[PDB]
Design an enzyme around this catalytic site. Structure first.
Site, mmCIF file in Angstrom:
data_model
loop_
_atom_site.group_PDB
_atom_site.id
_atom_site.type_symbol
_atom_site.label_atom_id
_atom_site.label_comp_id
_atom_site.label_asym_id
_atom_site.label_seq_id
_atom_site.Cartn_x
_atom_site.Cartn_y
_atom_site.Cartn_z
ATOM 1 N N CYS A 1 1.061 -1.059 0.076
ATOM 2 C CA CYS A 1 -0.025 -0.012 -0.071
ATOM 3 C C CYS A 1 0.859 1.048 -0.074
ATOM 4 C CB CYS A 1 -0.928 0.016 1.166
ATOM 5 S SG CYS A 1 -0.160 -0.738 2.650
ATOM 6 N N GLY B 1 -0.128 -1.557 6.833
ATOM 7 C CA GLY B 1 -1.375 -1.691 7.299
ATOM 8 C C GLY B 1 -2.239 -2.330 6.430
#
Ligand SMILES: [Cl-]
Length: 286
Positions: free
Chosen positions: A222, A227
């Site tokens: 990401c 996360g």
């Protein structure tokens, strides 16, 4: 006893959801310090510091993806770690969204580490900020160092875009496909409202992975590659767990992720989201 049989998961979830997710908060707090004392020396080398998107998201040496070296040992460096999947210690590479100065490194990792699938869990820009370089080409071939990439197809849906490329090493004349699963619909803040889309997206990735040779890590990123990335990897692992063992151990999975890269599943909301994923999967098992 973090292993929960699926037959007991819903009750477990309700229990953990009580008092504002107290139980989940406790599990997640228990994960807080996991892996953080693992050395990250390569990531901290002066020459490599600028190869890190975030100064506090550094690959642990023990799991970091090491690239070929040309002229300098730090050539081996990329902010990425092998993350175990359900099947093997190298099912995944979690990495940051590459930077302008690490694009070549990124593709070199893709090439050298036999990546056929990239899972991208961010828009390049989120809330007017660059989260990730647009590191992939259009139909027109682009060279990233010795690696040439050309997009062969692109299918856009609102939820995600899937891009196929041919990746070629110009030095060796070797090539192979790469499919990039671009999940474009993760909310700018917080986790997705529902789990089905991300789960269906995971299924798409997995469907493709069935076609892929062995020892081909799924490259997942990401922004920081911790996360959303950790969430996606955990969901993938949980689904196998559920399918193969009728049990889940979200804690054990995230723990394992944290032993490989900092911050994997980076917010409590994500951790609860994982549990939501499990609940939804179990419930969706008619
Ligand atoms: Cl390991």
């Amino acid at each position: 006893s973090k292993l929960i049989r699926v037959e007991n998961f819903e009750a477990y979830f309700k229990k953990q959801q009580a008092d504002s997710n107290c139980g989940f908060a406790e599990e997640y707090e228990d994960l807080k310090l996991i892996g953080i004392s693992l050395p990250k020396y390569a990531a901290e080398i002066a020459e490599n510091r600028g190869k890190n998107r975030y100064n506090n998201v550094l690959p642990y040496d023990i799991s970091r993806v090491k690239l070929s070296v040309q002229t300098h040992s730090t050539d081996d460096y990329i902010n990425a770690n092998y993350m175990p999947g359900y099947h093997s210690k190298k099912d995944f590479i979690a990495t940051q969204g590459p930077l302008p100065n690490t694009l070549k490194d990124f593709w070199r990792m893709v090439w050298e580490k036999n990546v056929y699938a990239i899972v991208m869990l961010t828009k390049c820009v989120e809330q007017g900020r660059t989260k990730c370089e647009e590191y992939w080409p259009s139909k027109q071939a682009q060279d990233y160092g010795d690696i040439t990439v050309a997009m062969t197809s692109e299918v856009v849906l609102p939820e995600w875009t899937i891009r196929d490329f041919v990746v070629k090493n110009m030095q060796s004349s070797e090539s192979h496909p790469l499919r990039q699963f671009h999940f474009t619909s993760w909310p700018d803040h917080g986790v997705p409202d529902t789990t089905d889309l991300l789960i269906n997206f995971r299924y798409l990735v997995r469907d493709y992975m069935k076609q892929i040779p062995p020892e081909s890590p799924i490259l997942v990123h990401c922004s920081a590659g911790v996360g959303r990335t950790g969430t996606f990897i955990a969901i993938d692992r949980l689904i196998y767990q559920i399918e193969n063992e009728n049990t889940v151990d979200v804690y054990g999975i995230v723990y394992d992720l944290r032993m490989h890269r900092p911050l994997m599943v980076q917010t409590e909301d994500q951790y609860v989201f994982l549990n939501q994923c499990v609940l939804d999967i179990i419930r969706a098992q008619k």
